[PDB]
Amino acid sequence: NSSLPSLRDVFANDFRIGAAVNPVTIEMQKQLLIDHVNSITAENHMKFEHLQPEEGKFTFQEADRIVDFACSHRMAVRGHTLVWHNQTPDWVFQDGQGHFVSRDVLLERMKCHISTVVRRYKGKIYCWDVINEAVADEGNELLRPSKWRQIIGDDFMEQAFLYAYEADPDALLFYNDYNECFPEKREKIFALVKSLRDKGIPIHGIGMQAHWSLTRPSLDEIRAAIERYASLGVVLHITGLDVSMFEFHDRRTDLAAPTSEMIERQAERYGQIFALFKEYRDVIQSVTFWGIADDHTWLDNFPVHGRKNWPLLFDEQHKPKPAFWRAVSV
Numbered sequence: 498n499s500s501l502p503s504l505r506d507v508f509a510n511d512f513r514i515g516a517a518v519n520p521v522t523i524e525m526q527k528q529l530l531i532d533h534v535n536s537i538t539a540e541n542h543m544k545f546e547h548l549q550p551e552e553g554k555f556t557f558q559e560a561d562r563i564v565d566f567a568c569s570h571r572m573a574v575r576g577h578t579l580v581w582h583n584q585t586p587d588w589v590f591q592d593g594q595g596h597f598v599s600r601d602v603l604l605e606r607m608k609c610h611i612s613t614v615v616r617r618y619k620g621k622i623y624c625w626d627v628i629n630e631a632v633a634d635e636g637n638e639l640l641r642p643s644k645w646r647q648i649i650g651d652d653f654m655e656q657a658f659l660y661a662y663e664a665d666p667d668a669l670l671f672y673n674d675y676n677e678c679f680p681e682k683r684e685k686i687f688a689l690v691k692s693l694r695d696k697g698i699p700i701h702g703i704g705m706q707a708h709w710s711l712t713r714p715s716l717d718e719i720r721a722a723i724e725r726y727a728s729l730g731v732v733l734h735i736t737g738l739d740v741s742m743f744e745f746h747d748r749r750t751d752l753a754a755p756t757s758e759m760i761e762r763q764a765e766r767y768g769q770i771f772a773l774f775k776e777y778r779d780v781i782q783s784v785t786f787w788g789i790a791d792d793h794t795w796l797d798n799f800p801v802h803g804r805k806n807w808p809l810l811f812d813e814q815h816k817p818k819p820a821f822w823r824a825v826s827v
């Protein structure tokens with residue numbers, strides 16, 4: 498209640514504090530957001546499928562509500578996300594006869610979408626995840642396969658950044674990805690961003706999703722990743738932080754509540770993480786959780802459909818967890 502510290506105040510001098518929302522959860526969690534965050538991200542309603550579900554049909558209504566909420570409460574907004582292998586409708590890659598479109602056609606659709614979306618929120622949204630998760634998560638290759646990449650070629654990302662920059666040259670443009678602290682994938686992300694910067698491409702930041710577990714990645718791997726990326730001269734945002742109660746191999750569905758030890762280790766893990774972020778306050782400018790309280794989290798159904806997870810600083814009744822007290826006292 499009254500005597501609880503406010504996350505954004507606690508970290509006033511370190512970084513912004515954000516949360517991913519939709520219009521429902523804005524209503525359901527309004528007070529937590531008003532009390533703690535100074536930054537908002539749309540969990541789903543600014544991805545391609547929720548902005549242009551059919552060609553020439555733009556559905557900005559839900560995204561507008563999110564932006565209106567943020568502006569009415571002095572909160573910044575991160576835009577998420579323009580170009581991604583997921584949650585993009587099929588029409589984008591097809592012609593009238595069901596076949597794939599050409600390089601030049603896909604570029605015009607990319608440019609048209611990026612221009613329409615970014616111009617609408619120009620001067621309200623201060624940064625954009627332009628490219629999401631383009632690096633390969635496994636294997637020897639640099640890049641994931643995607644229809645973006647297959648149709649256009651490997652320079653589809655340079656084009657995306659240049660289209661966004663032209664639509665709003667005052668925005669900070671980000672490459673955004675997960676498993677960003679595993680060394681092999683860290684070096685791919687580093688190598689990709691380095692090459693883009695070395696060509697003069699307007700990429701200003703790296704977004705570290707940080708969909709983490711109690712164990713992985715280690716504090717040393719997080720520190721190395723921060724330093725490797727920060728050495729490129731880019732801004733760093735932590736963009737989707739949560740601390741899952743299950744490791745990747747742990748696919749149990751029948752846990753009705755977190756254990757005493759899970760709750761305690763999570764508190765400790767969050768304390769170590771925010772200590773590391775504070776230490777690197779000079780390169781980390783924002784820390785956004787993918788949610789805010791345990792009554793809404795995508796981890797309830799990912800990677801295991803139909804279970805429950807407890808990944809955030811507040812519980813389902815919106816009360817501070819022990820993780821809260823450790824996080825604010827670094």
Ligand SMILES: O[C@@H]1[C@@H](O)[C@H](O[C@@H]2CO[C@@H](O[C@@H]3CO[C@@H](O[C@@H]4CO[C@H](F)[C@H](O)[C@H]4O)[C@H](O)[C@H]3O)[C@H](O)[C@H]2O)OC[C@H]1O
Pocket residue numbers: 540541583629675676706708737745795
């Ligand atoms: O409602 C959900 C919505 O919340 C969700 O948003 C995206 C979630 O995060 C990002 O996408 C996922 C990142 O994590 C990957 O999974 C990893 C698999 O490999 C590891 F082992 C690791 O432990 C996992 O974290 C997923 O494959 C990605 O899709 C995006 O940036 C968000 O937009 O997604 C859509 C809605 O259903």
